[PDB]
Amino acid sequence: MISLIAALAVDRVIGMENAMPWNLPADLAWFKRNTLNKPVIMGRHTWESIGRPLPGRKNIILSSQPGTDDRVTWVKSVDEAIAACGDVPEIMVIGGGRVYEQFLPKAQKLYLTHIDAEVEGDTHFPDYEPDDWESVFSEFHDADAQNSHSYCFEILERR
Ligand SMILES: NC(=O)c1ccc[n+]([C@@H]2O[C@H](COP(=O)([O-])OP(=O)(O)OC[C@H]3O[C@@H](n4cnc5c(N)ncnc54)[C@H](OP(=O)(O)O)[C@@H]3O)[C@@H](O)[C@H]2O)c1
Ligand SMILES: Nc1nc(=O)c2c([nH]1)NC[C@H](CCc1ccc(C(=O)N[C@@H](CCC(=O)O)C(=O)O)cc1)C2
């Protein structure tokens, strides 16, 4: 199945590396935890922002242009991206906006981190009908010495 994983600020603003202020090792640990040894599908801008393949994961990059890095697998359509994952239990789509929009209809799971921040941003996580999703897990954390904002992990499952 297909899952999306995202960090959402207020108004469900999303962004790239440099745009995202917070320092949530807790959130990056959550990401690592939930994506490890699963294929990750991302759009070209997200790829360029991360700057290096995620280790121990198959990295699949969407782009309309031929690939420019032999360290990752390049694909030119959603269906090709899915095919390039082979037969795994769970495919992780790690953004960005354009990619989340295309994969949401296909997804069965959302892993969201709701961050208590207003950030500069126009790019938002896709709107999804709440009627089609059930929250099955959530866990709130206050900011601390090594995490800058409060945040809440959430997992939703498609009914
Ligand atoms: N300055 C501003 O006001 C502003 C506002 C909004 C966003 N932004 C910028 O937007 C970028 C992030 O956008 P995003 O989150 O939407 O990026 P993203 O999803 O991570 O990457 C989008 C790219 O993925 C590829 N892609 C996606 N779907 C595809 C498909 N079906 N077939 C082939 N290729 C596909 C395309 O690459 P190719 O281009 O290679 O085809 C597309 O440009 C950042 O660089 C951010 O700075 C800036
Ligand atoms: N939960 C969550 N938080 C986020 O900040 C993001 C998402 N999801 N989803 C999409 C995008 C992911 C951007 C993104 C992903 C991974 C790394 C990265 O390098 N992760 C390492 C751990 C970082 C470290 O070593 O400190 C990893 O191996 O997973 C950086 C940026 C932003």
**Determination technique for this PDB entry?**
X-ray
Which architecture does CATH list for 1-159?
3-Layer(aba) Sandwich (3.40)
The span from the CA of 67 to the CA of 28, in Å, is: 27
The span from the CA of 119 to the CA of 109, in Å, is: 25
Query: How do the domains of the chain map onto residue ranges?
Result: 1-159
For 42, list phi and psi in degrees, rounded to 5.
-145, 160
**Residue 114 C-alpha from the chain's centroid:** 13
**What are the angstrom distances between the C-alpha of 67 and each of 48, 62, 94?**
12, 9, 18
Pocket of ligand 2 (CB under 6 A): 5-7, 17, 20, 27-28, 30-32, 50, 54-55, 94-95, 113
b/e burial code for range 100-132 (CB count within 10 A of at least 16 → b): bebbbeebebbbbbbbebeeebeebbbebeeee
**Ligand 2 pocket test: which of 8, 18, 20, 31 has the largest number of ligand atoms within 8 Å of its C-beta?**
31
